[PDB]
Amino acid sequence: MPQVADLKAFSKHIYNAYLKNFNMTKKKARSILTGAPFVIHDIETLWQAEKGLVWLPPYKEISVHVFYRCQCTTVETVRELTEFAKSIPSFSSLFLNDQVTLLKYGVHEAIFAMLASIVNKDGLLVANGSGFVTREFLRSLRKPFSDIIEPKFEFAVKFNALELDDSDLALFIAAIILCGDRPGLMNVPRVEAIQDTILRALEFHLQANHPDAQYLFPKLLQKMADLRQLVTEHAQMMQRIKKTETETSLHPLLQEIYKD
Amino acid sequence: DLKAFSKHIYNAYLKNFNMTKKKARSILTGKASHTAPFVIHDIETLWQAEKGLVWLPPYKEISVHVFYRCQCTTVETVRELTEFAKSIPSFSSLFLNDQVTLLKYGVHEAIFAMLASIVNKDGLLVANGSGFVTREFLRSLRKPFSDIIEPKFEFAVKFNALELDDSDLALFIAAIILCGDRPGLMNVPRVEAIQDTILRALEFHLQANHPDAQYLFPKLLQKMADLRQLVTEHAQMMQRIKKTETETSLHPLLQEIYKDMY
Ligand SMILES: CC[C@@H](Cc1ccc(OC)c(CNC(=O)c2ccc(C(F)(F)F)cc2F)c1)C(=O)O
Ligand SMILES: CC[C@@H](Cc1ccc(OC)c(CNC(=O)c2ccc(C(F)(F)F)cc2F)c1)C(=O)O
Ligand SMILES: CCCCCCCO[C@@H]1O[C@H](CO)[C@@H](O)[C@H](O)[C@H]1O
Ligand SMILES: CCCCCCCO[C@@H]1O[C@H](CO)[C@@H](O)[C@H](O)[C@H]1O
């Protein structure tokens, strides 16, 4: 079976792309969270985490400081997501502008998907896994900043119940980046064709890697839809931070992604 | 290090551009190492080149057919320029969005600077130098399209009077692409810093490669200024074509480059 033959190799390639670009894989992340990273749960422990136990604009307050490290995390992941996508021959063949349009509208989606990897019901891993910030502490932050937090956890725990691994994730992230309906795409048919190849690869892969999971594939299609929505609710809160939190900075890259 | 810099840009140029000025100049003069290009100066010759000899939208008229080939040439050049710019380690470290902005406001400046390499007072080479389209025939074209051509020639001949070789050109085009004052540049200081390195490289390279060239460095900076003016007018001429020549297509990539240019 040619089609099934190509796809399996095309899926392995993407996997190798994911493996050499992301500093944090679920394999690595899931081991740390089970069986030790310094637990951050208050101001005192965070300060400790900054001084050495684990680890930006001038300090301002606690909630704004966490928001900044959240921004940085995005700036770093966006680089990795850039190298990931470039490592797909099909992607880098498109003119640079379409590549930008894809990354711009898809990185946050890919981010919250991958965020589920370093997350469990009680908190998330930080600083290459050396730290673990508690969800309860994250909630305790100031209302404007603590709102962008909780939705990510609700999505993450429900997502982790699907029990996907890095090989599935690589394909998943690839399918999110290569999306045909992004605003202003120049070569839609070319991008659409690629997304279809990635999905067919994911489909076969899921049958091989998860032979007993009932409707995993359509479920993952729904999660892609769930992510597009999660990004929207997030972008809205990000819009509220820019309006009401006038004293707090916004990294230039995030500024360019959220621009209309 | 600064030399290692120029050498890397030179190997990047030679590796990403099939048609270099050396090869271009070899054919344009007469060297044995090459075949003779077919001369296209009318409809019969062009049609002759289209079939075999030398070598899209349905053929409507000659002026529009050529315009289209000019559009394609630009598109493939833009592919080569992306690969070139990318081959500069420092450039690729910039966020993609900034790489696009740089390429958007720079590709045409680069293109009209390299047009000089394959151009002469009587015409220009086409299809890998296997054809030579006459300047005359280009002027013969129906008014609107005959206009976006002559200026390129006017500039090219003059630019060719500075007798630059591919080694100069490698750094020259690099200096164009990494222009720190492009509209919407996210990380300006970084692009301005990389630009400075490139120019110091150019200045340093022109002393060795051109021991007698009086004021060459400042002359080229003026050319870079000249090139920006040439694109502004070029863009203006195109947006006009898009309005009045409502039936003539415009490649989506060109539509996106010109869109915000005024
Ligand atoms: C506004 C930042 C992000 C979105 C976002 C939204 C939620 C979220 O996590 C729940 C993270 C990722 N955050 C982190 O990786 C992170 C990193 C460090 C710390 C802390 F506390 F240690 F400082 C807390 C964190 F949530 C990112 C963006 O909009 O680009
Ligand atoms: C308008 C299309 C170009 C601009 C432009 C302006 C001038 C010019 O050359 C003088 C070329 C490049 N043209 C070609 O490479 C070219 C290619 C094929 C033919 C021909 F004659 F064979 F049809 C004629 C040509 F000038 C391109 C663009 O805006 O990107
Ligand atoms: C290497 C050649 C690159 C050519 C790039 C042309 C880019 O055009 C710009 O693409 C942006 C999205 O990426 C749009 O938001 C801008 O409105 C548009 O003007
Ligand atoms: C790999 C990460 C890429 C992040 C890209 C963020 C891109 O923002 C967009 O950059 C375009 C120029 O490139 C501008 O024309 C658009 O107005 C701007 O919204």
From Swiss-Prot, chain A:
Residues 38-260 form the NR LBD domain. Belongs to the nuclear hormone receptor family. NR1 subfamily. Transmembrane segments: none annotated. GO terms for molecular function: DNA binding; DNA-binding transcription factor activity; DNA-binding transcription factor activity, RNA polymerase II-specific; DNA-binding transcription repressor activity, RNA polymerase II-specific; linoleic acid binding; lipid binding; NF-kappaB binding; nuclear receptor activity. It comes from the Eukaryota. 'Lys-48'-linked polyubiquitinated; leading to proteasomal degradation. Deubiquitinated and stabilized by OTUD3. Ligand-activated transcription factor key mediator of energy metabolism in adipose tissues. Receptor that binds peroxisome proliferators such as hypolipidemic drugs and fatty acids. Has a preference for poly-unsaturated fatty acids, such as gamma-linoleic acid and eicosapentanoic acid. Once activated by a ligand, the receptor binds to promoter elements of target genes. Regulates the peroxisomal beta-oxidation pathway of fatty acids. Functions as transcription activator for the acyl-CoA oxidase gene. Decreases expression of NPC1L1 once activated by a ligand. The chain holds residues 170 to 439 of 441 of the full protein. GO terms for biological process: adipose tissue development; apoptotic process; apoptotic signaling pathway; axon ensheathment; cell differentiation; cell population proliferation; cell-substrate adhesion; cellular response to hypoxia. Heterodimer with the retinoid X receptor. Interacts (via domain NR LBD) with CRY1 and CRY2 in a ligand-dependent manner. This is Peroxisome proliferator-activated receptor delta. Ubiquitous with maximal levels in placenta and skeletal muscle. It is found in: Nucleus. GO terms for cellular component: chromatin; nucleoplasm; nucleus. Keywords: Activator, DNA-binding, Metal-binding, Nucleus, Receptor, Transcription, Transcription regulation, Ubl conjugation, Zinc, Zinc-finger.
